[PDB]
Amino acid sequence: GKGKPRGLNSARKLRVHRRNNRWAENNYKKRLLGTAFKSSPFGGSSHAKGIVLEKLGIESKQPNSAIRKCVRVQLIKNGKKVTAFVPNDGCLNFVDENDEVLLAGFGRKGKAKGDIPGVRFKVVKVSGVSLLALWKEKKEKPRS
Amino acid sequence: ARGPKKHLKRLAAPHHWLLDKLSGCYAPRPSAGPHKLRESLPLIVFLRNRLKYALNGREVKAILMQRHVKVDGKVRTDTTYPAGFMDVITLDATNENFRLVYDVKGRFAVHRITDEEASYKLGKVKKVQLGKKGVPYVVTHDGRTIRYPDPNIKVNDTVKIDLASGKITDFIKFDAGKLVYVTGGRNLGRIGTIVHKERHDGGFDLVHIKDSLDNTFVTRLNNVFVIGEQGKPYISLPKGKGIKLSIAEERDRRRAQQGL
Amino acid sequence: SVGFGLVYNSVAEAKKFEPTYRLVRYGLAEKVEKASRQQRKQKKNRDKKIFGTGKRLAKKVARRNAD
Amino acid sequence: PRAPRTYSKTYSTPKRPYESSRLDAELKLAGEFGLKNKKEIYRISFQLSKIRRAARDLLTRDEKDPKRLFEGNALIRRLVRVGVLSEDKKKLDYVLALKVEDFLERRLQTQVYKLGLAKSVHHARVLITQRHIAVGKQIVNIPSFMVRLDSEKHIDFAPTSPFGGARPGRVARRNAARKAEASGE
Amino acid sequence: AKVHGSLARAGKVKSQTPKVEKTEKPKKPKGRAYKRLLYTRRFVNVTLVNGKRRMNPGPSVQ
RNA sequence: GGAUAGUGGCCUACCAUGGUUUCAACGGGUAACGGGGAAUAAGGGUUCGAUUCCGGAGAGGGAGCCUGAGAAACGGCUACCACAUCCAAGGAAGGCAGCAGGCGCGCAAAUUACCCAAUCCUAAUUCAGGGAGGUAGUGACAAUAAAUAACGAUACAGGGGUCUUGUAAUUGGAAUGAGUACAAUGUAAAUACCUUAACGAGGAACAAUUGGAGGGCAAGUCUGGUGCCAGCAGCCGCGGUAAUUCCAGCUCCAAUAGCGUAUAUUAAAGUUGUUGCAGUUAAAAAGCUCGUAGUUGAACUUUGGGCCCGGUUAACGGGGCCUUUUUACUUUGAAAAAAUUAGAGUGUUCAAAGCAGGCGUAUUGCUCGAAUAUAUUAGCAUGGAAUAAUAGAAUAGGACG
Ligand SMILES: NC[C@@H]1O[C@H](O[C@H]2[C@@H](O)[C@H](O[C@@H]3[C@@H](O)[C@H](N)C[C@H](N)[C@H]3O[C@H]3O[C@H](CO)[C@@H](O)[C@H](O)[C@H]3N)O[C@@H]2CO)[C@H](N)[C@@H](O)[C@@H]1O
Ligand SMILES: NC[C@@H]1O[C@H](O[C@H]2[C@@H](O)[C@H](O[C@@H]3[C@@H](O)[C@H](N)C[C@H](N)[C@H]3O[C@H]3O[C@H](CO)[C@@H](O)[C@H](O)[C@H]3N)O[C@@H]2CO)[C@H](N)[C@@H](O)[C@@H]1O
Ligand SMILES: [Mg+2]
Ligand SMILES: [Mg+2]
Ligand SMILES: [Mg+2]
Ligand SMILES: [Mg+2]
Ligand SMILES: [Mg+2]
Ligand SMILES: [Mg+2]
Ligand SMILES: [Mg+2]
Ligand SMILES: [Mg+2]
Ligand SMILES: [Mg+2]
Ligand SMILES: [Mg+2]
Ligand SMILES: [Mg+2]
Ligand SMILES: [Mg+2]
Ligand SMILES: [Mg+2]
Ligand SMILES: [Mg+2]
Ligand SMILES: [Mg+2]
Ligand SMILES: [Mg+2]
Ligand SMILES: [Mg+2]
Ligand SMILES: [Mg+2]
Ligand SMILES: [Mg+2]
Ligand SMILES: [Mg+2]
Ligand SMILES: [Mg+2]
Ligand SMILES: [Mg+2]
Ligand SMILES: [Mg+2]
Ligand SMILES: [Mg+2]
Ligand SMILES: [Mg+2]
Ligand SMILES: [Mg+2]
Ligand SMILES: [Mg+2]
Ligand SMILES: [Mg+2]
Ligand SMILES: [Mg+2]
Ligand SMILES: [Mg+2]
Ligand SMILES: [Mg+2]
Ligand SMILES: [Mg+2]
Ligand SMILES: [Mg+2]
Ligand SMILES: [Mg+2]
Ligand SMILES: [Mg+2]
Ligand SMILES: [Mg+2]
Ligand SMILES: [Mg+2]
Ligand SMILES: [Mg+2]
Ligand SMILES: [Mg+2]
Ligand SMILES: [Mg+2]
Ligand SMILES: [Mg+2]
Ligand SMILES: [Mg+2]
Ligand SMILES: [Mg+2]
Ligand SMILES: [Mg+2]
Ligand SMILES: [Mg+2]
Ligand SMILES: [Mg+2]
Ligand SMILES: [Mg+2]
Ligand SMILES: [Mg+2]
């Protein structure tokens, strides 16, 4: 029983068979395949600067109804086009076409969050100030 | 890496210098000596860090360049000069002398010997061979080569050595129950006598030891230095006389003489 | 307070063994005048470019009429 | 390539942050000691845990073990010397029972209140951090100063300030000088 | 999902709510002195009971 | 044989056909310099290490070389390729992964400062030189310490005549550094720290913040705004007219000179399972049998008896007698860098640290320190002979004198 070798000489059959089944673990897979460095819009980094293409309102999922006010962004280091959500209230007015905004994840391990389908990123800064200091009125966005 | 390395980094220095972590990135890097800079005392360490006579780097030179210090009978100009085991270090204007001998923790101890006993030194004969013309020769731990020696002397003896001249005043052979100072190792700095020498063909003979308090322990033959006849060294050992008192035993003796 | 002090066996022996930055604030010596390290450094780099007295050189300058 | 100057963090923060009860017990300890932030409660429970864990793996060693001898008795002797472990509770078993209020009790703040000199823990601190509670000759303004057992009797007001010695404060010495032109010329 | 909706109303609720000023009020103690007031109001005082030890009720029921 | 400083297919000549591999060669990837170490803190582990120390490699890419004890050197030369500077058009010069500093890159990182005083190195050498190094600027990386108030008075509520807290914004004198600054102190010279004249406290200033208040999860059935809109919401969910959830006011919780967010990683995770998973039906026993590798494989060979010597709190431990007398493993040790981890000691005012210090007669002084233990693989020496392997006389080519 136990289905696995306990023999005193069996170290390699053990050491291997685990190294084999570790591949079933999602977190381990991603590390070996280099998933982030390849398949991710960010390089595997925590943030990306990009530039806004078009302001995008997005319908929500069930059972919710509202327009979510996102943007299309083209990452500078990358060129990969990505859609990011603009949070709080009426901050879409703070970003415009071709505004050069800084992005971050949603904290979801790459998944999309909440009633917003297919948006994995959020705006952090605009023009290099912040979403707070604008929405909280503390600072103000400069001119181009 | 392209040649000789002219620097030493602090934290890379020998531990038995007892340098402090901060105060610089570098140690003195002892000069090319009679002794291996691994196990050796640069003059600056002795004068400045032990005798506390010199406060500076520039100050140690002002002493030597004032012609003050000698070592093993001869004046030593070199700041980093590597005074090793069984050395002399006479300072006339201070009237003192010091024979370098190890602690029971294993560091070079600051040990004053009188205007005599700084006459002679002991050294361990590392090899004895035939030189040119047939002339036999012998050389000590510190690289003294002495010519036309006693046919009894073999490797792993010691030799009593006059300084102002040289040569050989008697000697001590290596056999059961001789006095021995431990040159380096886990047991470095200890003193004892020979319980047995475990022979090993092709390197690393074990030497069994017993001290004045009847403790047993072993080290390498290469680190076994004969210091004389059992219970009677040929030089003056410091306090504890290399007895290796246990850490527990230490605490008492510190809180013993500590009171009123 | 805590500090250090030295009692010398001559004044001429403190005229010798003593670090010279004290000898100014002690009055026994004079603060030396030198341009800042780089200005001191640069002039040395300028001069090694000339191999000689530098005398025949600056004349050959005026041999061809200045620079 | 400077020698690598070392350091450490003095506290360990709790796993489950929001526990409804523990929050209260800490708040009390903040008041019934007179502590600034919850970190000064954390600092001690971390100290205690390493103290405990030290004794934890020490009692695992069958007795007459030099490690249980030399080290275990080097703890007690330090632990009593500050007044935490009572003059004799001394054992490796009685440090494991030693709780968090015992260290906190020995703080210079929680002493300066204890015998005279303060009559508040908030007056205590304010006194400590401002100059004069000094122990012996040296002023020590640290509210955490950790009074040792026999250092106790040497703690009184400091050789300076209105409480222990020369001159009064310049709050009042300014009051006496503003009647100098009022009641004088 | 369906990616083109109205952008017309954004900052709507926020900008149609009336501004309310924050009252000028006594500055609260900092440091240990704030942690002093918390000691009392939770116990040594016993503002509220029924075993709830209510920290912040709407001004009770009656 | 030649070549080297020298061994060696290092190269050449002749000769043979060898050498490695499922115990994983060879090949590919590495967002790979190796190590000391770091994060995590039942145990067993998982993850990381460009980076203070050691070793290695390189100086745009390659190769070649001169000098030399030492270089296949680059702040040396020669060539090529790729850059790139001056030019009078003939020519000439260059290598910041040294210190600064510029452009570029991006989420991502500081002054074209001072100095040889310290640590040290170099030289013909106490003197000179050192962007090694040190100082200072920038510096919320990280770590330590831990101000933002303290005590009465009076006026009402309240606990056995009267304390002792709760509340007034009605007063009362107290205190202190944050600043500010003679000085001296520090220092190479300043800078700041420490010590200190004169100055420095009434709420408005010497005004703490960041997140959150349905559950998880600690704190609003309060008011106003909005009306499945604007928005919140890690997840469950909130909002479609009386919103515990959005925007705010009020209050309240939480941690607090710091709190939040993104990303990675660890714990939780016995959801990688050696410890320690699960597999009839939730994910999952090959259709069936053979079988190489691999892993695994019954028992039996000195058992028992009798005395002795010296050990440590009759239980037990160690060393010898008598009775017909090759490994794997396990202990002890040696040889193990310093940092780092653990840890002894010590009043840096506490502490993080540091490895100093401590007593004195303080008028030519005494003096204890700088302990201790650690990755358990390999190697070396050693005691142990259970366990599991291995050899031994079968056509005797056996042992013995
Ligand atoms: N500015 C830093 C660097 O300077 C370099 O330029 C320098 C080099 O081209 C050349 O430097 C030579 C060097 O080639 C040679 N192999 C060594 C020599 N010592 C250097 O010489 C230099 O230093 C001496 C003082 O020693 C000074 O007279 C002068 O600054 C210069 N001739 O002289 C230039 C300075 O005058 C390059 N432009 C570049 O790598 C970088 O800009
Ligand atoms: N720091 C001093 C010591 O250095 C040691 O360094 C190691 C190596 O330097 C040394 O390696 C060997 C040595 O085994 C042997 N008996 C002598 C030999 N010359 C050394 O090797 C030397 O030459 C080789 C080949 O050129 C180089 O690759 C190597 O870097 C160099 N050290 O052996 C040491 C132990 O393996 C250790 N790090 C340590 O004991 C200690 O730190
Ligand atoms: Mg859903
Ligand atoms: Mg999309
Ligand atoms: Mg900008
Ligand atoms: Mg931006
Ligand atoms: Mg940015
Ligand atoms: Mg040197
Ligand atoms: Mg070596
Ligand atoms: Mg040959
Ligand atoms: Mg050869
Ligand atoms: Mg072939
Ligand atoms: Mg690489
Ligand atoms: Mg790595
Ligand atoms: Mg590395
Ligand atoms: Mg851990
Ligand atoms: Mg663990
Ligand atoms: Mg676990
Ligand atoms: Mg890299
Ligand atoms: Mg890396
Ligand atoms: Mg290196
Ligand atoms: Mg380059
Ligand atoms: Mg020559
Ligand atoms: Mg090189
Ligand atoms: Mg070079
Ligand atoms: Mg080169
Ligand atoms: Mg260069
Ligand atoms: Mg021309
Ligand atoms: Mg640079
Ligand atoms: Mg940029
Ligand atoms: Mg940064
Ligand atoms: Mg960084
Ligand atoms: Mg210097
Ligand atoms: Mg100099
Ligand atoms: Mg001269
Ligand atoms: Mg920071
Ligand atoms: Mg303030
Ligand atoms: Mg100050
Ligand atoms: Mg909120
Ligand atoms: Mg709750
Ligand atoms: Mg409402
Ligand atoms: Mg909520
Ligand atoms: Mg609200
Ligand atoms: Mg696990
Ligand atoms: Mg096991
Ligand atoms: Mg499972
Ligand atoms: Mg199934
Ligand atoms: Mg199949
Ligand atoms: Mg430590
Ligand atoms: Mg068996």
Side-chain angles (χ1 to χ4, degrees), chain A residues 2-88:
Chain A
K2 230 67 169 159
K4 56 173 186 182
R6 346 183 82 110
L8 210 278
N9 280 350
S10 92
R12 202 191 288 102
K13 163 69 143 306
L14 299 192
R15 175 170 104 273
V16 161
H17 172 272
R18 177 92 299 108
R19 196 160 101 276
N20 272 3
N21 288 274
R22 277 276 256 171
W23 284 100
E25 292 163 42
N26 228 329
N27 183 28
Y28 175 79
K29 215 202 301 292
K30 312 286 138 300
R31 259 200 290 277
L32 297 195
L33 307 187
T35 292
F37 297 113
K38 304 188 173 196
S39 308
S40 160
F42 298 7
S45 56
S46 59
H47 288 84
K49 216 151 74 175
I51 294 185
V52 161
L53 297 198
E54 59 149 321
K55 295 148 67 77
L56 259 192
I58 293 177
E59 297 174 354
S60 53
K61 304 205 292 183
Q62 280 288 268
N64 283 14
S65 164
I67 302 304
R68 304 260 63 118
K69 317 295 190 312
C70 312
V71 293
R72 285 229 89 170
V73 199
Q74 194 165 19
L75 311 188
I76 307 184
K77 66 178 195 173
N78 221 357
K80 297 194 180 176
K81 303 176 189 65
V82 73
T83 167
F85 164 81
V86 196
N88 312 133

Side-chain angles (χ1 to χ4, degrees), chain D residues 114-131:
Chain D
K114 231 54 182 180
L115 212 82
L117 289 143
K119 207 185 173 306
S120 188
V121 293
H122 306 60
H123 189 210
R125 183 184 280 263
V126 155
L127 270 171
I128 306 153
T129 92
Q130 293 175 330
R131 310 329 303 188

Side-chain angles (χ1 to χ4, degrees), chain E:
Chain E
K2 332 211 313 171
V3 86
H4 276 115
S6 177
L7 298 206
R9 39 198 196 277
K12 166 231 202 289
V13 155
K14 151 127 187 176
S15 172
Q16 71 182 168
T17 51
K19 180 73 167 193
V20 198
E21 227 63 35
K22 333 181 75 171
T23 66
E24 203 171 1
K25 54 226 317 165
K27 154 222 170 189
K28 268 74 56 151
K30 323 299 182 182
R32 164 214 79 255
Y34 184 62
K35 242 72 180 183
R36 174 185 208 161
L37 215 162
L38 272 304
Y39 188 12
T40 53
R41 75 186 325 174
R42 212 156 306 190
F43 26 66
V44 160
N45 137 273
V46 77
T47 43
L48 260 129
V49 203
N50 147 279
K52 242 309 120 56
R53 135 81 344 240
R54 285 296 265 86
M55 255 131 303
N56 187 52
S60 206
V61 285
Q62 161 95 97

Side-chain angles (χ1 to χ4, degrees), chain B residues 168-183:
Chain B
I168 286 194
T169 57
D170 203 37
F171 67 91
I172 297 91
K173 271 273 292 191
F174 194 97
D175 45 32
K178 287 278 187 302
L179 242 192
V180 155
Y181 218 163
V182 174
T183 321

